[PDB]
């Protein structure tokens, strides 16, 4: 038919079989018009209805809107002129062809539709969308054929359609110009994020990010510069979608588990899939288009090898293949980078949905379920298992895609080499099992090794917390050796893991070499009719390069799916657990009684006895009541049951209004002290200042170094147990609730501040007078002031009444009350730690691999050329066997050098990991005490934890990957320039683009990786903090505040990760385009020089210029990764080079048994705590008698504490000297001093481990010497009770031992040492007077033969010494015997008068 639509031939293949080919005009004017117009009309009705059903308001008019609309107006006018010239010129005189009329008539209809859809677009947020952008591209790429046909016909000299040709040329020019205007963003000027307003072309090329790239280059960037994340991706948006499917599938699985057997599992993957399925479909279609286009380039490669293998194939075929190579690679790059945007965004959305669901569950999980986990083990559920589901979600499409790429590669190989490909398949089926075994083994070693790290870190945290005691006792060598041993076993595992990883990477790298050496050898040896040529060889090498990624990726997805299955069981177990039962505690307000117990019973364990048995009491408003009894009788369980933190056995409790709670064990948040007091409430100056005074807190705030704004918390300044207790009561009293529950808060503070706090805060004269207050006490001191008292016996109420009524009744209380009687030198530091001798041979082995690789490609280029000299009958068998032999030899040679390079490097990186730790630890233990006072302990721990882990884990594999990519690029550029040296002129321009794109990327990505790394840890420390605080958070009803604070943290991290993900999608567009241009210009050189080239050279060049493109990208990715991770070596190096104390042992040795008398002597002494300060102590001058007993005293701030520090040389002397037994303590080695003096520390600390190593970590004393030390300490009767005697184990900080035996055990340690000189610095805190008395008599009984110096804050502790020493302005004022010092009125007498002592 079309022959009489156009009066000319529609198709004739004899137009293409010539040097000057063109298409028939009938084909151009029909099919190449109907393609772009058919795309427009089939979809425009839907695109119009989509806007009509989603419009809100019009945008402003713009210059670009005018400019687009007027040029489509010219397209409409030209279509009218074109129809007018056909309709007037025909004059009815001849039968003009139909096409001459239909085509203009179609264009008139289309330009009216284009004006209409452009007008409709002014309601949308994104103006220039995909729909019109692909119409202009399709129109311009179809019109290009007719453009060259018309201009070539006109240039040949025919003018028969000149006017029509001009109307076409103008219409083609204006479409290119409309496409250029259609590229710009045409902003709404919304400051939120450019990605919502960006055009289709800017979106696919990520050209809306250049605004951050140009910002992060010229100056540092910060969290205010990073765009806020999209509303579809906010934590509230994701959790409210996910929870809808979670509840549905969890309830279904619960019902299925209840239908069986007559916890639920296999529901979390169903809930995730149903939440996100639409993102999976969009990702699948993009990946499938890439997996089609990846097999186009090998077919276009074969055509170019054929075009070089004869010289009468038409010249236009060569240029057309070069254009199609560039075009196919460009379309593939845009699809691939979109697929990655969707996949890496989905992995972040899955993490966010799990982390926020785990957090919200923790606030409501039952007590029986919660006891099954440690705090660190619940934090690992958010830190490890949520991250494992992200790491799998990023790559899961590789499970189907890798199989498809393998099957298509085997098909396109059978087409080139027939049945011989089965010899290559025999290699591919052997390597996949081996990689899955080595990958699951190395993952198993990595998980087992994780336990050793935790043990080392826990010991370190106790070493750095106890460092003052390690210095006093000279114990640093014992704790140094203890850490080193655990490191050795950790390094042994690290070497085995590193060796398994190096053989896995070797097999991934060599498999294309092995499979090609096997396949070409079998093909040539099996049948003498088989002869190898450039088309078969260099095409097959391209398919062997396509196979490398899917063959290595499949084993790693299999071993990762086996890991994520364990993480899924842990998440399903936790999220499926029972919610807390509220039904036994009732909040009926207006109950005319604040609290009411109805025969109730409760327990800590539903299998066990009731801990608070039948109890029946009730209490009215504004009533202060006290709870008392013997130890373990039930006291703190009564408050815990009232809060609902226990299992009900019987009855119920009723409560009226709001509650405040103070626990026996204090909970404190990271923040300022002011933030902990205000606890999310608004500030109000008068009330705030009144609370700080009432809680006796101002005397602490006067001496904390930050004042009221001091950084308290685990990552901040440390506070005493009495300070943490005051702060806890100060928080509770600021909130102003109805009911106060107190779990014996006075138990951690002295009786004088206790009396002050009782009168100010909670007594019938204090702040809380209008509030009902239930007070647990172990002390009797305040009972006379209470409204009503109850005694508990064996979990139930025994007696009740006022204080006087209990004594008048003569109950058991009346007898019991008788108890009241980037710089380059950092890279060089790391290379010297590996050692420069190994760097040389590792680099030499990597270079020899590159030379053997080049040699094997040159040999194959020679081998295929034999096919033009010989034939299937005449090829010599000696030459066949010689060609096969040395190709196998060059295949083996590069296998040997790659194995030597990888396997040697594993010993090099493990050697550096050892040296850096060994030098850090040895410096830190020698640091002076100023370092530990000025530096917060969490900072030092991070260097020993995260940094050491960075240096020994990721760092090594980044350096290996970089040198592998670098030599791959250099090897490839050498082979191209060796084949056609004119290409060296094209290398300079592309090299200037490449180094510029690297410079702009690496300046930004390094900052986003830092900004991610600093903002992630606050999520896990806040989760650890809230899980530790649950009964406090519930008692105040604060759950909604805490949920919002978690959402703010997660959203703040989420934007740093997503903008870093975007930053590497931008990079890839530029570097894949630079890569694509190397193959396009390389292909063109070999078309223009076809007279002096062969199919062998063209195959040799294009084959490895096709694999360059992903290597060009990965070299820049690794450069950013190394520049990020190398900072770990800087931080370690910083502390490795901080200052040290005086030598522990000097040649000047003290004589044998040196402290023989104890003649301590001071001359004009002077000290300051830091070079920045004036002197704390000045001009001290004294002589101390052999075995003399001394007290030191002075007005608070006298500086007394300087003596105990400087006598051990913790502080170095500013002037004067000190002597002991004729030796000056400044000349002797620092351990030879410390080890001879004996000190009892002010505050007891124990190290987690045996009773044996807590008394003697050097294992130097004998078993009976320790038993008599516990006898003299009076602990024998306790230690003999434990199943293990001296081998029994203490937990963290000794927490399984109560405070009485802790203080006593620290006295027992000193008894074993038993030296001639003893220091005592009495503490100013609460103590059990029985333990105080038995310690004080033991001091007088057992150290009778020692010289003794005592420091105390009360004169009744001093008053029986041989001498008293009084100083105030850091200078001596008086000294004498303690009666004579009172006998004449003077400094000490006035004090003793103020103390009531004299
Ligand atoms: C010299 C020889 C060069 C050596 C290495 C080049 C590239 C290596 C990348 S593999 C690099 C890959 N980029 C691609 O474009 C892969 C294209 C491939 N055809 C595919 O289908 O995936 C990629 O992983 N991109 C994701 C990203 O941007 O993070 C691997 O490290 C990815 C490992 C993925 C994994 O197992 O988790
Ligand atoms: C796949 C396309 C887009 C690019 C590859 C080049 C194409 C256009 C080339 C490669 C081989 C060519 C064919 C080779 C031989 C003949 C036989 C002759 O009697 C008619 C032309 C015909 C049938 C050619 C048509 C054009 C052709 C198919
Ligand atoms: C890519 C778009 C924008 C433009 C493409 C235009 C192409 C197809 C045009 C531009 C210049 C044209 C060439 C100009 C001159 C000659 C010389 C003549 O003896 C044969 C045709 C030939 C060789 C033309 C072939 C077609 C041609 C290459
Ligand atoms: C497909 C799109 C993207 C590009 C199309 C390019 C076409 C129009 C180009 C590419 C190669 C060109 C040919 C290259 C060489 C010759 C030989 C010369 O003696 C006459 C022109 C002729 C035959 C050209 C005609 C136009 C041509 C076929
Ligand atoms: C047209 C767009 C899409 C791509 C650009 C292709 C370029 C590189 C192609 C298209 C047309 C080609 C020309 C067409 C015709 C001839 C005449 C011939 O005796 C020498 C080569 C020469 C001079 C070609 C050189 C390369 C050329 C200019
Ligand atoms: C396998 C190992 C032991 C071999 C050692 C490789 C050495 C020579 C390589 C590995 C990583 C490299 C560094 C990686 C990144 C940068 C930042 C860039 O702006 C300048 C070059 C510089 C500083 C490189 C210098 C050379 C380097 C240190």
Find out whether 766 is annotated in a ligand binding site: no
Q: Is residue 601 part of a domain?
A: no
Find out whether 1194 is annotated in a ligand binding site: yes
List the Cα angle 533/535/536 in 5-degree steps: 70
Residue at token pair 């450019």? 194
The answer to whether 1165 and 1370 are in contact (CB under 8 A) is no
Find out whether 1199 is annotated in a ligand binding site: yes
Sign of CA dihedral 1104, 1107, 1108, 1114: negative
What stretches of 761-835 show up as alpha helix (H) in DSSP? Answer: 803-809, 813-816, 824-834
Cβ atoms within 10 Å of 1298's Cβ, excluding its own: 10
Q: CA 1266 to CA 1255: how far, in whole Å? A: 8
Distance 39 CA to ligand 3 centre (A): 28
Find out whether 1200 is annotated in a ligand binding site: yes
SS (HEC) of 544-590:
HHHHHHHHHHHHHHHHHHHHHHHHHHHHHHHHCCCECCCCCEECCCC
Where among 204, 222, 243 does a domain terminate? 204
Nearest to 661 by CA among 757, 761, 728: 728
Q: Report the Cα 1355 to chain-centroid distance in Å.
A: 55
Q: Which residues line ligand 5 (CB under 6 A)?
A: 319, 323
Tokens of 1346: 């020692």
Ligand 4 atom nearest to 21, measured from its CA: 23
Distance 552 CA to ligand 1 centre (A): 11
Find out whether 371 is annotated in a ligand binding site: no
Question: Domain residues for 1310?
Answer: 1239-1314
Q: How many domains in the chain?
A: 3
Q: Is 1111 in the pocket of ligand 1 (CB under 6 A)?
A: yes
Q: Is residue 815 part of a domain?
A: no
Q: Is residue 79 part of a domain?
A: yes
Pocket probe for ligand 1: among 405, 549, 1104, 1118, the residue whose CB has the most ligand atoms within 8 Å is 549
Q: Is 16 in the pocket of ligand 2 (CB under 6 A)?
A: yes
Q: Report the Cα 970 to chain-centroid distance in Å.
A: 35
Nearest to 558 by CA among 443, 397, 446, 440: 440
The answer to whether 667 and 728 are in contact (CB under 8 A) is yes
Residue at token pair 């002589």? 1183
**Segment holding 1102, helix H or strand E:** helix 1095-1105
> 593-615 burial by CB neighbour count: b if 16+ within 10 A, else e?
ebbbbeebbbbbeeeeebbbbbb
> 980-1007 burial by CB neighbour count: b if 16+ within 10 A, else e?
beebeebeeeeeeebeebbebbbbbbbb
Where among 184, 204, 224 does a domain terminate? 204
DSSP letter at 707 equals G
Distance 136 CA to ligand 3 centre (A): 21
Pocket probe for ligand 5: among 140, 147, 151, 319, the residue whose CB has the most ligand atoms within 8 Å is 319
Sign of CA dihedral 681, 682, 683, 687: negative
Distance 317 CA to ligand 2 centre (A): 9
Contacts of 211 (CB under 8 A, 6+ apart): 194
Q: Is residue 138 part of a domain?
A: yes
Distance 1337 CA to ligand 6 centre (A): 68
Tokens of 1304: 């006593």
Q: Are strands 1189-1193 and 1363-1367 parallel, antiparallel or unpaired?
A: parallel
Determine which residue's CA is closest to atom 10 belonging to ligand 6: 959
The CA–CA distances, whole Å, from 166 to 8, 31, 147, 174 equal 22, 22, 10, 12
Q: CA 359 to CA 348: how far, in whole Å? A: 17
Q: CA 610 to CA 653: how far, in whole Å? A: 15
Determine which residue's CA is closest to atom 16 belonging to ligand 3: 152
Sign of CA dihedral 485, 486, 489, 491: negative
Q: What is the CATH number of the domain that holds 667?
A: 3.40.50.300
Distance 13 CA to ligand 2 centre (A): 9
DSSP letter at 1163 equals E
Residue at token pair 């198709």? 11
Q: Is residue 174 part of a domain?
A: yes
Distance 980 CA to ligand 1 centre (A): 30
Cβ atoms within 10 Å of 1223's Cβ, excluding its own: 18
Q: CA 1190 to CA 911: how far, in whole Å? A: 55
Distance 959 CA to ligand 6 centre (A): 7
Q: CA 845 to CA 842: how far, in whole Å? A: 5
Q: Is residue 166 part of a domain?
A: yes
The answer to whether 83 and 129 are in contact (CB under 8 A) is no
Residue at token pair 């002390």? 779
**Segment holding 1364, helix H or strand E:** strand 1363-1367
Distance 983 CA to ligand 3 centre (A): 25
Diameter over CA atoms, the chain:
147
Pocket probe for ligand 4: among 138, 315, 316, the residue whose CB has the most ligand atoms within 8 Å is 316
Distance 476 CA to ligand 3 centre (A): 84
Find out whether 630 is annotated in a ligand binding site: yes
Q: Is 1054 in the pocket of ligand 6 (CB under 6 A)?
A: no
Residue 1314 Ramachandran class (φ > 0 left, ψ -120 to 50 alpha, else beta):
left
Ligand 2 atom nearest to 317, measured from its CA: 6
DSSP assignments along 642-663, one per residue: HTT-SEEEEEEEEE-S-EEEE-
The span from the first CA to the last CA of the chain, in angstroms, equals: 131
Find out whether 453 is annotated in a ligand binding site: no
The length of the chain is 1398
Q: CA 819 to CA 815: how far, in whole Å? A: 8
Q: Is 1110 in the pocket of ligand 1 (CB under 6 A)?
A: yes
Tokens of 1334: 């038995």
Contacts of 816 (CB under 8 A, 6+ apart): none
Beta bridge partners of 598: 652
Find out whether 635 is annotated in a ligand binding site: yes
Nearest to 1105 by CA among 990, 1224, 1235: 990
Q: Report the Cα 493 to chain-centroid distance in Å.
A: 23
Distance 1095 CA to ligand 4 centre (A): 22
Nearest to 758 by CA among 745, 771, 740, 743: 745
Q: Which residues line ligand 4 (CB under 6 A)?
A: 19-21, 144, 148, 315-316, 319-320, 323
Beta bridge partners of 672: 711
Tokens of 678: 């205000």
Cβ atoms within 10 Å of 1196's Cβ, excluding its own: 7
Tokens of 724: 């943490």
DSSP letter at 946 equals I
Task: Considering every ligand atom shown, identify the ligand nearest to the alpha carbon of residue 344 and give its number.
Answer: 1
List the Cα angle 1214/1215/1219 in 5-degree steps: 110
Sheet containing 1215-1220, strands listed edge to edge, beginning at the edge strand earlier in sequence:
1177-1183, 1160-1167, 1215-1220, 1223-1224
Determine which residue's CA is closest to atom 17 belonging to ligand 2: 17
Where among 1314, 1330, 1345 does a domain terminate? 1314
Distance 321 CA to ligand 2 centre (A): 12
DSSP assignments along 77-137, one per residue: HHHHHHHHHHHHHTTTTS---THHHHHHHHHHHHHHHHHHHHHHGGGSSSSS-HHHHHHHH
- Cα atoms in the 13 Å half-sphere on the side-chain side of 1028: 16
Q: Is 1271 in the pocket of ligand 6 (CB under 6 A)?
A: no
Beta bridge partners of 1367: 1372
**Segment holding 335, helix H or strand E:** helix 315-362
Residue ranges with strand state E in 1153-1262: 1160-1167, 1177-1183, 1189-1193, 1215-1220, 1223-1224, 1238-1240, 1249-1250
This structure's resolution (Å) is 2.8
Cβ atoms within 10 Å of 700's Cβ, excluding its own: 18
User: How many helices and strands, by DSSP H and E, does the chain display?
Assistant: 49, 25
**Dihedral Cα 869, 874, 877, 881, nearest 10 deg:** 30
Distance 158 CA to ligand 5 centre (A): 22
Distance 151 CA to ligand 5 centre (A): 14
Sheet containing 624-628, strands listed edge to edge, beginning at the edge strand earlier in sequence:
659-662, 739-743, 772-776, 624-628, 788-793, 796-801
Count the helix, strand and coil residues of the chain and give each as a percent rounded to the nearest 5. Answer: 65, 10, 25
Q: Is 177 in the pocket of ligand 2 (CB under 6 A)?
A: no
SS (HEC) of 492-547:
HHHHHHHHHHHHHHHHHHHHHHHHHHHHHHHHHHHCCCCCCCHHHHHHHHHHHHHH
Nearest to 1238 by CA among 1331, 1152, 1345: 1345
The CA–CA distances, whole Å, from 808 to 800, 815, 1262 equal 13, 12, 58
Find out whether 633 is annotated in a ligand binding site: yes
Q: Is 1064 in the pocket of ligand 1 (CB under 6 A)?
A: yes
Q: Is 302 in the pocket of ligand 6 (CB under 6 A)?
A: no
Q: Is residue 1355 part of a domain?
A: no
Q: CA 820 to CA 831: how far, in whole Å? A: 71
The answer to whether 723 and 678 are in contact (CB under 8 A) is no
Q: CA 931 to CA 1043: how far, in whole Å? A: 38
Residue at token pair 């600390």? 1245
The answer to whether 704 and 623 are in contact (CB under 8 A) is no
- DSSP 3-state of 992: helix
The answer to whether 755 and 674 are in contact (CB under 8 A) is no
Task: Considering every ligand atom shown, identify the ligand nearest to the alpha carbon of residue 967 and give its number.
Answer: 1
Ligand 6 atom nearest to 908, measured from its CA: 3
**Segment holding 595, helix H or strand E:** strand 595-603
The answer to whether 903 and 502 are in contact (CB under 8 A) is yes
Q: CA 182 to CA 127: how far, in whole Å? A: 9
Ligand 1 atom nearest to 557, measured from its CA: 36
Tokens of 1344: 């009778």
Q: Is residue 169 part of a domain?
A: yes
Q: Is 1106 in the pocket of ligand 6 (CB under 6 A)?
A: no
């Amino acid at each position: 038919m079309l022959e009489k639509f156009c009066n000319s031939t529609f198709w004739n293949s004899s137009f293409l079989d010539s040097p000057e080919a063109d298409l028939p005009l009938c084909f151009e004017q029909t099919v190449l018009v109907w393609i772009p117009l058919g795309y427009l009309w089939l979809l425009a009705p839907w695109q119009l209805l989509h806007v009509y059903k989603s419009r809100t308001k019009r945008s402003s008019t713009t210059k670009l809107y005018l400019a687009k609309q007027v040029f489509v107006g010219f397209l409409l006018i030209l279509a009218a002129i074109e129809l007018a010239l056909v309709l007037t010129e025909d004059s009815g005189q001849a039968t003009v062809p139909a096409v001459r009329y239909t085509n203009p008539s179609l264009y008139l209809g289309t330009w009216l539709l284009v004006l209409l859809i452009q007008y409709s677009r002014q309601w949308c947020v994104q103006k220039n969308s995909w729909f019109l952008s692909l119409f202009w591209i399709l129109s311009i790429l179809c019109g290009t054929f007719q453009f060259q046909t018309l201009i070539r016909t006109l240039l040949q000299g025919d003018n028969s359609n000149l006017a029509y040709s001009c109307l076409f040329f103008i219409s083609y020019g204006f479409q290119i110009l409309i496409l250029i205007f259609s590229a710009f963003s045409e902003n709404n000027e919304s400051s939120n994020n450019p990605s919502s307003i960006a055009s289709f072309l800017s979106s696919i090329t990520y050209s809306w990010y250049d605004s951050i790239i140009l910002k992060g280059y010229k100056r540092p960037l910060t969290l205010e510069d990073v765009w806020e994340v999209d509303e579809e991706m906010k934590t509230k948006t994701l959790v409210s979608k996910f929870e809808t499917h979670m509840k549905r599938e969890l309830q279904k699985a619960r019902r299925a588990l209840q239908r069986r057997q007559e916890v639920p599992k296999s529901w979390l993957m169903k809930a995730l899939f149903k939440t996100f399925y639409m993102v999976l479909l969009k990702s699948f279609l993009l990946k499938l288009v890439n997996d089609i286009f990846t097999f186009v380039s090998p077919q276009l490669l074969k055509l170019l090898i054929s075009f070089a293998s004869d010289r009468d194939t038409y010249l236009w075929i060569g240029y057309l293949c070069a254009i199609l190579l560039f075009t196919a690679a460009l379309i593939q790059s845009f699809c691939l980078q979109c697929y990655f945007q969707l996949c890496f965004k989905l992995g972040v959305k899955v993490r966010t949905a799990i982390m926020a669901s785990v957090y919200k569950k923790a606030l409501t999980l039952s007590n029986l379920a919660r006891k099954e986990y440690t705090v660190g083990e619940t934090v690992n559920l958010m830190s490890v298992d949520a991250q494992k589901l992200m790491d799998v979600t990023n790559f899961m499409h590789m499970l189907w895609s890798s199989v498809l790429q393998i099957v298509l590669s085997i098909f396109f190989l059978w087409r080139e080499l027939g049945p011989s490909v089965l010899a290559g398949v025999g290699v591919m089926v052997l390597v996949i099992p081996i990689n899955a075994i080595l990958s699951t083994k190395s993952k198993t070693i990595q998980v087992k090794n994780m336990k050793n790290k935790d043990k080392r870190l826990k010991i370190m945290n106790e070493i750095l917390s106890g460092i003052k005691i390690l210095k006093y006792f000279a114990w640093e060598p014992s704790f140094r050796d203890q850490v080193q041993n655990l490191r050795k076993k950790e390094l042994k595992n690290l070497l085995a893991f590193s060796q398994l990883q190096c053989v896995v990477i070797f097999v991934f790298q060599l498999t294309p070499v092995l499979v090609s050496v096997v396949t070409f050898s079998v093909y040539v040896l099996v049948d003498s009719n088989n002869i190898l040529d450039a088309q078969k060889a260099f095409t097959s090498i391209t398919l062997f390069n396509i196979l490398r990624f899917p063959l290595s990726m499949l084993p790693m997805m299999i071993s990762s799916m086996l890991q994520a299955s364990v993480s899924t069981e842990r998440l399903e177990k936790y999220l499926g657990g029972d919610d807390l039962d509220t039904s036994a505690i009732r909040h009926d307000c207006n109950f005319d009684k604040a609290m009411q117990f109805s025969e109730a019973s409760f327990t800590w364990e539903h299998d066990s006895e009731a801990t608070v048995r039948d109890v029946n009491l009730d209490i009215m408003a504004g009533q202060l009541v006290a709870v008392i009894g013997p130890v373990g009788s039930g006291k703190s369980s009564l408050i815990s049951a009232m809060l609902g933190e226990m299992e009900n056995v019987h009855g119920h409790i009723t409560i009226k209004g709001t509650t405040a709670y103070v626990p026996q064990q204090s909970w404190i948040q990271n923040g300022t002290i002011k933030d902990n007091i205000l606890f999310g409430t608004e500030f109000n100056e008068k009330r705030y200042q009144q609370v700080l005074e009432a809680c006796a807190l101002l005397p602490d705030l006067e001496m904390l170094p930050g004042g009221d704004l001091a950084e308290i918390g685990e990552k901040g300044i440390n506070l005493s147990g009495g300070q943490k207790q005051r702060i806890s009561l100060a928080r509770a009293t600021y909130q102003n609730l109805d009911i106060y529950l107190l779990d014996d808060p006075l138990s951690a503070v002295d009786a004088h501040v206790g009396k002050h706090i009782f009168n100010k805060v909670l007594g019938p004269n204090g702040l809380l007078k209008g509030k009902t207050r239930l007070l647990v006490t172990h002390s009797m001191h305040f009972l006379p002031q209470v409204d009503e008292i109850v005694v508990l016996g064996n979990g139930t109420i025994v007696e009740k009444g006022s204080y006087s009524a209990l004594l008048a009744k003569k109950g058991e209380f009346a007898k019991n009350l008788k108890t009241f009687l980037v710089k380059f030198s950092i890279y060089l530091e790391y290379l010297q730690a590996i050692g420069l001798f190994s760097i040389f041979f590792i680099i030499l082995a990597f270079v020899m691999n590159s030379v053997a690789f080049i040699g094997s490609n040159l040999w194959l280029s020679a081998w295929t050329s034999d096919s033009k000299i010989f034939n299937s009958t005449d090829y010599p068998a000696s030459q066949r066997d010689m060609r096969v032999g040395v190709y196998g030899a060059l295949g083996l040679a590069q296998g040997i050098f790659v194995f030597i390079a990888h396997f040697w490097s594993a010993f090099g990186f493990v050697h550096a990991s050892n040296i850096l730790h060994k030098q850090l630890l040895n410096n830190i233990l020698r640091a002076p005490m100023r370092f530990f006072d000025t530096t917060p302990t969490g900072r030092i721990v991070n260097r020993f934890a995260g940094d050491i882990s960075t240096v020994d884990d990721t760092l090594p594999q980044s350096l290996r990957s970089w040198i592998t990519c670098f030599l791959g690029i250099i090897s490839t550029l050498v082979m191209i320039c060796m084949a056609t040296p004119v290409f060296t002129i094209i290398v300079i321009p592309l090299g200037i683009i490449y180094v510029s794109v690297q410079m702009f990327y690496v300046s930004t990505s390094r900052q986003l990786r830092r900004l991610d790394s600093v903002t992630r840890s606050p999520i896990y420390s806040h989760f650890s903090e809230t899980v530790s605080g649950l009964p406090v958070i519930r008692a105040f009803e604060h759950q909604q505040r805490f949920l919002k604070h978690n959402e703010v943290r997660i959203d703040t991290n989420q934007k740093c990760v997503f903008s870093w993900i975007t930053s590497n999608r931008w990079l890839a567009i530029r570097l894949e385009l630079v890569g694509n241009l190397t193959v396009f210009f390389s292909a063109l050189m070999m078309v223009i020089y076809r007279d002096t080239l062969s199919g062998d050279t063209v195959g040799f060049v294009l084959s490895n210029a096709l694999n360059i493109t992903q290597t060009l990208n990965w070299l820049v990715r690794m450069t950013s990764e190394i520049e990020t991770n190398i900072v770990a070596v800087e931080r370690i190096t910083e502390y490795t080079k901080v200052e040290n104390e005086a030598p522990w042992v000097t040649d000047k040795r003290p004589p044998p048994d040196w402290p023989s008398k104890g003649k301590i002597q001071f001359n004009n002494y002077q000290v300051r705590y830091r070079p920045e300060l004036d002197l704390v102590l000045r001009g001290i001058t004294c002589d101390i008698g052999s075995m003399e007993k001394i007290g030191v005293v002075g007005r608070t701030g006298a500086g007394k504490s300087s003596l105990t520090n400087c006598l051990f040389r913790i502080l170095e002397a500013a002037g004067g000297q000190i002597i002991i037994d004729g030796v000056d303590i400044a000349s002797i080695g620092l351990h030879d001093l410390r080890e001879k003096l004996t000190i009892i520390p002010q505050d007891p600390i124990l190290f987690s481990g045996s009773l044996r190593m807590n008394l003697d970590p050097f294992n130097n004393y004998s078993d009976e010497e320790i038993w008599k030390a516990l006898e003299l300490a009076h602990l024998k009767s306790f230690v003999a009770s434990l199943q293990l005697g001296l081998s029994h184990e203490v937990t963290e900080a000794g927490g399984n031992l109560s405070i009485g035996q802790r203080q006593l055990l620290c006295l027992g340690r000193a008894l074993l040492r038993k030296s001639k000189i003893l220091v005592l610095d009495e503490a100013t805190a609460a103590v059990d007077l029985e333990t105080d008395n038995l310690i004080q008599t033991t001091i007088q009984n057992e150290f009778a033969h020692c010289t003794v110096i005592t420091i105390a804050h009360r004169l009744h502790t001093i008053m029986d010494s041989d001498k008293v020493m009084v100083l105030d302005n850091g200078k001596i004022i008086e000294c004498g015997s303690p009666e004579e010092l009172l006998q004449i009125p003077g400094p000490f007498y006035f004090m003793a008068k103020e103390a009531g002592i004299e």
